[PDB]
Structure formats: structure tokens, C-alpha cells
Amino acid sequence: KKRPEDFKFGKILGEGSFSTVVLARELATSREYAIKILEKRHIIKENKVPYVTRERDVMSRLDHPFFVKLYFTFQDDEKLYFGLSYAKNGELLKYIRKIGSFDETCTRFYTAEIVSALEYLHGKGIIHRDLKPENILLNEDMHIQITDFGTAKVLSPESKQARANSFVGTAQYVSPELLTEKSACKSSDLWALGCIIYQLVAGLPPFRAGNEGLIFAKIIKLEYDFPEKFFPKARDLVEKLLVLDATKRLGCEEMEGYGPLKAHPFFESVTWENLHQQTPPKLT
Ligand SMILES: Nc1ncnc2[nH]cnc12
């Protein structure tokens, strides 16, 4: 292949430090895409080529309903273009802020979608490393579409790699092992999941401060509290995820993976099959 003139560009969906995402319609098919556009001069000058390459390589591996899809890539002299699925309802974070928190049914449903997504991702040997509500988009049907793969890692199957050495993430969601051991693992995403479940119920993530270093100090000490009213089985689940030892988090490989996590009592009423076809509960 496609070229820019094959599309009609509409509204700007997002502006980042080195990318712009624009809604577009492909003329020959009438399909809508979110097109992420990178200016080559800028990505070269600012040493972002590895992250752009990583995003393309990781997204090309993914095929599951709970991820943003990469349908095509093309470039011209100035720019690289990634054709992505359009998530019309934007970031999960927007809904947390607006409603303040989610009821139990909605927490359960969205948590189950995230767990299903992570099961798929980790089953492919990929760590996200920057899981957070801003990176969990919502499609027109209000199912999740996880994005932001330029800081993800494909663990090498040939070496049975478990640990990744790049320092990436977001302070509120970063795992203690990355801070203290300088590496992340698949279980690092389970720590982020714990933060996210907490945030859905309480309205804010559990380790928070106006300076990143203050957050790091709390993470490494497991310094957080629950508000007095927090759904008890969700509290139990969070306490099984926000564990300093990454080999002791429910869902991790050392604990036999996603079957035991899906078996947690908080999920007793979830039907895991065809979750992407179930009608999400309305957010109120
Ligand atoms: N795929 C997408 N859909 C909607 N907004 C986005 N912002 C970044 N990627 C997006």
C-alpha cells in the first residue's frame, strides 16, 4: 505494498514523542484502520529504530482477539506507516477515571479478558513489560485490545530464555525484580496485572507518588494498603499477584501457569471459552 494515497486520512487519534496515529479509510476496500506514522529522520536521529523494529516484529506474531492487530506496513521517503486495528472506544484508563471504579462484575469481566490475553502472550514466549490501563484499548464492542509492543520482548525459545535485560516500563506498574535484579520475566506482567485489578476496584494503582523514585521505594518494600471496602475475593487475588518473589505469583511458570490463575475463586463464574464473543457488562 500500500501507499499513502491509497487512504483517506481523518482525525488524529494520538500524538506521541515520535509517532502520530491517524484514523484512515482504505479507498479500495472501505475499511477503517488506525495508522501509526513514524517520521524516519526523527526515529533515526533519536535512536528509536530498535523500538519501531520491535513493535513490528512482535505485532506480526500476534493473532488473538484481545490484541491490536498489525494488518500491513509501508513506507515512503519520509515515513513509515503501520496499519493497525482501530479501537473506537479508546483507553481503559478513561473509563476508570470517569466512573471512579468498576463494580465486581465489570472488574471480573475485564480482568478475565486481560488474563486471557496474557495467557496467549506468555504462551508465545512474549513479555509485554508495559501493561497498564493506557495500553489497554477498547473496541466498538467494548472488548479489550492491548497495544504498545515496542517495549515488549520475544524470549528466545532456542536458549529457553526466561529473563530480559532492557530497562523499560512505567513506574506505577514496574516489577520489583526489574528494579532490584535489573531483569524482567513473564511474571513481571502478572505484577502489573495485580496493580491493574487493584486500580479497577480502588480507583488508583497501589503504589503511587508524585516522583518515580518514591514509587520505587514502595514497590520494593511491598508498601501498599487496601481500602476498607474492596471485594474480598479480588483482594485475595491481588495478594497472590503482588508478591515480591516473581516465582510465587499466581499464573507464573513456576506455579504451573494460567490454569491455576483461572481457577482462582474470584473467577468462579467466568466462562473462559469464547470470552471475546460474550457481551461485556455495561460500565456504570
Ligand atoms: N489502534 C488504535 N485505535 C485507536 N486509538 C489508538 N491510539 C493508538 N493506537 C490506536
CA dihedral sign of residues 173, 275, 55, 4: negative
Annotated resolution, angstroms: 1.3
The DSSP result for 173-187, as a single string, is G--HHHHHHS-B-HH
The number of C-alpha atoms within 13 Å of 89 and in the hemisphere containing its C-beta is 16
Distance 244 CA to ligand 1 centre (A): 33
Distance 40 CA to ligand 1 centre (A): 20
Q: Which amino acid is at 208?
A: R
Binding-site positions for ATP read 17-19, 36, 85-87, 91, 134, 148
Closest of 133, 151, 114 to residue 276, by C-alpha? 114
Tell me the residue ranges of DSSP E strands in 17-129. Answer: 20-26, 32-39, 70-75, 79-84, 126-127
Distance 34 CA to ligand 1 centre (A): 6
Contacts of 231 (CB under 8 A, 6+ apart): 104, 107, 201, 266
**Rounded CA separation 107/264 (Å):** 14
Ligand 1 pocket member 13 (CB < 6 A): yes
Contacts of 104 (CB under 8 A, 6+ apart): 231, 234
The sheet with strand 32-39 has its strands ordered as: 7-15, 20-26, 32-39, 79-84, 70-75
Catalytic residue among 57, 130, 236, 245: 130
Cell numbers at 119, concatenated: 495467557
Ligand 1 atom index nearest CA of 13: 5
b or e along 148-171 (b: 16 or more beta carbons within 10 Å of the residue's beta carbon)? bbbbbbbbeeeeeebbbeeebbbb
Q: Which helix (H) or strand (E) holds 240?
A: helix 232-241
- Per the entry, the structure determination technique was X-ray
Q: Which helix (H) or strand (E) holds 144?
A: strand 144-146
Domains with residue ranges and CATH for the chain: 1-90 (3.30.200.20), 91-282 (1.10.510.10)
Ligand 1 pocket member 137 (CB < 6 A): yes
130 is catalytic: yes
